[PDB]
Amino acid sequence: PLIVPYNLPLPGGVVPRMLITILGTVKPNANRIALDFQRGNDVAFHFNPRFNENNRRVIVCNTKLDNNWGREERQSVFPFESGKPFKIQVLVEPDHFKVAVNDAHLLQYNHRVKKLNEISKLGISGDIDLTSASYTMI
Numbered sequence: 001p002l003i004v005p006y007n008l009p010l011p012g013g014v015v016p017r018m019l020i021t022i023l024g025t026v027k028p029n030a031n032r033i034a035l036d037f038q039r040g041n042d043v044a045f046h047f048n049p050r051f052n053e054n055n056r057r058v059i060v061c062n063t064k065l066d067n068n069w070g071r072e073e074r075q076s077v078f079p080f081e082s083g084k085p086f087k088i089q090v091l092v093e094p095d096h097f098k099v100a101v102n103d104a105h106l107l108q109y110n111h112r113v114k115k116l117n118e119i120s121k122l123g124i125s126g127d128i129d130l131t132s133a134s135y136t137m138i
């Protein structure tokens with residue numbers, strides 16, 4: 001029952017072996033969800049499930065620099081379901097964010113923004129009921 005859009009500060013930025021866990025439930029008839037790992041106004045890693053992009057469900061990932069979106073990376077494996085509870089785990093590895101949903105590996109996103117210690121907040125937005133958002137070291 002956290003309020004969305006939600007800002008999760010990441011004190012001191014991200015570092016390899018930091019694991020972010022998001023628990024929530026997708027709203028009925030959802031259209032979109034987004035996670036935004038932010039470096040100030042820049043978005044180092046945008047993770048964006050789209051439930052109806054031309055009648056397809058797709059995960060779009062990208063980076064926003066100086067207000068410009070870059071090259072999209074797309075994944076048609078789509079583990080989210082309207083009305084149902086999910087877990088997203090984002091593990092920071094040296095060279096990528098590694099994302100698992102409901103305990104199944106989903107995708108990796110190579111670091112475009114390389115000042116990891118400056119990626120010091122995570123925004124969570126879109127068509128979910130947000131249960132919890134936290135981090136720990138593994």
Ligand SMILES: Cc1ccc(S[C@@H]2O[C@H](CO)[C@H](O)[C@H](n3cc(-c4cccc(F)c4)nn3)[C@H]2O)cc1
Pocket residue numbers: 032033034046048060061062069070072125126127
């Ligand atoms: C040249 C051009 C034209 C169109 C577009 S479309 C754009 O694509 C981005 C990824 O490349 C990103 O998804 C962006 N976006 C989504 C949300 C968003 C906000 C609240 C909830 C949510 F679930 C998602 N905020 N910004 C979207 O507007 C991009 C480039």
